[PDB]
Design a binder for this molecule. Sequence first.
Ligand SMILES: C=C1CC[C@H](O)C/C1=C/C=C1\CCC[C@]2(C)[C@@H]([C@H](C)C[C@@H](F)CC(C)(C)O)CC[C@@H]12
Length: 254
Amino acid sequence: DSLRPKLSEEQQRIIAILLDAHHKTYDPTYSDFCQFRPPVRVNDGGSVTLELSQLSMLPHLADLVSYSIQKVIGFAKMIPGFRDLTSEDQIVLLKSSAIEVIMLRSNESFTMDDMSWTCGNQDYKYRVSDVTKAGHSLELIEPLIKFQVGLKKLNLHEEEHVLLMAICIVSPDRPGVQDAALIEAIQDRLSNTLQTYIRCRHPPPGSHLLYAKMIQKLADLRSLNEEHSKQYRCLSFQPECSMKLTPLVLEVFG
Ligand SMILES: C=C1CC[C@H](O)C/C1=C/C=C1\CCC[C@]2(C)[C@@H]([C@H](C)C[C@@H](F)CC(C)(C)O)CC[C@@H]12
């Protein structure tokens, strides 16, 4: 059975655009990271009370996430069709997808060598313990690491990666969207591109139900999104927390 239509010229163009958009918005040398407020790692081999007292890693990780949100805004703007949406719908989609696209794009620095996000020397190597020093708990972090491993092991082509990030952003089932049908049309064009790509270009056995595995990752992301939001709320109750964040982070997660 399994028909394998060739990518259309339009679908090839969509893929080219998204690759270019990623290459322009994702620096794989992490060369800007020395501009963030510095990482600080307090002794915390154990403590939620101490973590909240210090939030030693929060200014660095908030800057990292803020920077990443800016990059995702830039990427989104280059997604074919995104600019056909109204401004209110663009913003709803960005704010609701931001943490999920950050999680997806971070997969590129994530390494199964030692289950870290390695963005340079020791200073810019991020482990579970660094995320607890920014005030999050294991209810978010452990499923996040499991998600990163699961995604890594799909061995996505860059084409598939950038399409998944685009599909994540242009989702019609986000609360507060107005033109759901237009968003769904944009998404379907990207989804069809991805399905076609996988069937033409992705060798076996990694192609086996790869599309369904990728859609499952999107569902997984909704769950992480909800847990992050719960935890962010609690972190936001810590006095003086706002100075450790950024204006963009406060808006997107507030
Ligand atoms: C964000 C990226 C993209 C570029 C590189 O791959 C590095 C990178 C790593 C991304 C990482 C490694 C550090 C911890 C991060 C930022 C997770 C963290 C749960 C987010 C929270 F800390 C955010 C606030 C505090 C606002 O609630 C989500 C993705 C993780």
